[PDB]
Design a protein around this nucleic acid. Sequence first.
DNA 1: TGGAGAATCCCGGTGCCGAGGCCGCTCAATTGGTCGTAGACAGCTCTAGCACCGCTTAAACGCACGTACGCGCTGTCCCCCGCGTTTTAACCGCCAAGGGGATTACTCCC
DNA 2: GGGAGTAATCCCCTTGGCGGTTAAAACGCGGGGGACAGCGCGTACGTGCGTTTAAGCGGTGCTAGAGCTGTCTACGACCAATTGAGCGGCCTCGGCACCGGGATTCTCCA
Lengths: 72, 79, 95, 98, 105, 75
Amino acid sequence: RDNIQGITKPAIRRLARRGGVKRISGLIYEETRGVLKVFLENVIRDAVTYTEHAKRKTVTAMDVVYALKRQG
Amino acid sequence: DNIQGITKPAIRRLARRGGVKRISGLIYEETRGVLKVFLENVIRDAVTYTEHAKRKTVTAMDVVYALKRQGRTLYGFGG
Amino acid sequence: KTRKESYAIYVYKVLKQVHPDTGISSKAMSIMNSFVNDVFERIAGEASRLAHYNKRSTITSREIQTAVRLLLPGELAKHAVSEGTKAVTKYTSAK
Amino acid sequence: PHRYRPGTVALREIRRYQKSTELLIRKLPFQRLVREIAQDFKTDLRFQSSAVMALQEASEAYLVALFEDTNLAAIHAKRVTIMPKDIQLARRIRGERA
Amino acid sequence: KTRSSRAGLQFPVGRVHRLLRKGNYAERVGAGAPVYLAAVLEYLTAEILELAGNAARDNKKTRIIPRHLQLAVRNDEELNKLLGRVTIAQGGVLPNIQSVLLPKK
Amino acid sequence: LLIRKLPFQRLVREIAQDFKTDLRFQSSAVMALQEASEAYLVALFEDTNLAAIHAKRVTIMPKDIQLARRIRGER
DNA sequence: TGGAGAATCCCGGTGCCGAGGCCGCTCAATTGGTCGTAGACAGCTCTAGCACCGCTTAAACGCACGTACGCGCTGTCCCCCGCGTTTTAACCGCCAAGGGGATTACTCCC
DNA sequence: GGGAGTAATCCCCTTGGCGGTTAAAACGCGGGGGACAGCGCGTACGTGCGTTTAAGCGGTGCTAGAGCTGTCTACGACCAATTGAGCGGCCTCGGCACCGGGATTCTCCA
């Protein structure tokens, strides 16, 4: 439960400073947590069904790179 | 050049279809430029595929392939 | 004249199965034909990719099920999977 | 003399060309343009009519989508008019220009 | 006798099986795979023709025009997700004017 | 790496437990997931920075996030 | 604010062309049988994924505080829209030469 | 005695041209509302410091399950007969585009 708080405020700040962002508003964090959740939902579904095709119970790295090649 | 045939009211109608109220006077040159770039890319792909298929005339099915390769697929011309 | 293969009579039959009192035009016929061809090509290509990834030489109904679950979104995917498995069960259980 | 306030004709024209479906760019200038572009790559190439119509449909769709993105970028900067910098922003976010 | 009637479908199954062998998608092809694919294609055809028919009734017409297909695919969420990168000839655009553009007097 | 590894793996197991129970993972898979997520957020923040500089401002806002996602093509 | 006025929907009549049934051919889907091998299933091995514990120490949390700039207001001026009038080329309809792959006859050779 | 080279052609479509003419782009000008610059302010964001906490590294213990090999049996490739669905040519009549008159409905401003 509620493990989206692990993506913390200084980590978000470093991710913004890597892209060149100077100043951060206070409502940025709750939106970037949402877009990270949406992106992870869209990749982990394809990874789960790629694992389910092979009759396996472990998500391998090949399933992850296939799921990422699905999105591009 | 025949790029001037893409005239001012045609670009105006294209912008009014998109939901644009007011238009600056320098929109038109950039619109002609991006249209020429898009057409050049699509015709280059079409001429490539009709040359590899060894006919002298390009058809609609070849340009359906050309727009399919750019991720811009078009329905309604035999594709 | 040469012979051209289409899906026109079948989509006309489905249209009369769904809405009995509606017609269709030639341009809309071409659009629906292209729609069926594009969706068929996409699902066949994705099933070929799943066949190649698991080192198999045969495309079966499981590969089509996985390609449908990958390519279609939402409740439409679940309903299409249900209709396909009903059709496969009816074909196999038939005399 | 009757004179409309400046903007009513704009919404009227927006509604009129959002209801319709007829192609906005004329046929023969686009045919001249596609011949003039295509003679540069290879010579003595000919055209079917359906290829020209497909190219017209593609050009209409691409420019309508580009103008919608330009309009959203213009409204974002607290403006109503569209400017070329909005067009450059719209193509840079899409990733068409490096 | 025919396999489409055995499957209880309207789309052909032998034509789909021949198009699967011709495309060189795999060395072997199964038995229920064209049955599954024909059922999926028939079902997608069923919702797109349903929504086109409702749009054609709402427009007070008796025949499906490309404008009705455009309006059918652009108001359903899942079909617009599926057909996001596809353009329809003689389709037009949805009526959408943004809120700030209205003459707020 | 910028995001810590252990909260990210708790997040990916939490978001994957709703799709199939009793699932296991490889370490290369979650490393690839973390790398892809970091690249996605870096590119997103670059595009929202260009959106913010277009609006004559130096501080980014959530409206820049929705502008970048909408012009990009996402929902 | 309500009348003028211009745009817009609505209803009726006309007509014209393509949507859709019908007939006939034909060729690819269906039946039946044979044969070779792809993978279904079991079983064995042994790697790596998970659970748990403890120590250390950099990272994060929370609060104080200065001050930088986001936003609202005001002023200016300029440039694009609305409309009227002038020029112009798209379009329609017809006509003709001609590139081009299949359809016949005409003639020749091992 | 049958396969093959050469030519005319009946179409099939493409490109070029020629006259009219008519919608439609093009030019011009008033003016109004919107883009743009400047300023005031006050609040929300960056920085600093104490402090708490949980990530990271290491170490061990255990076992589910990936991964590979053997055997065979059902299942798909493939070939000959054949025959009914599905193609193409033809004909028609109703749905829809269009013209025209009229009532309705936004818009401006005194």
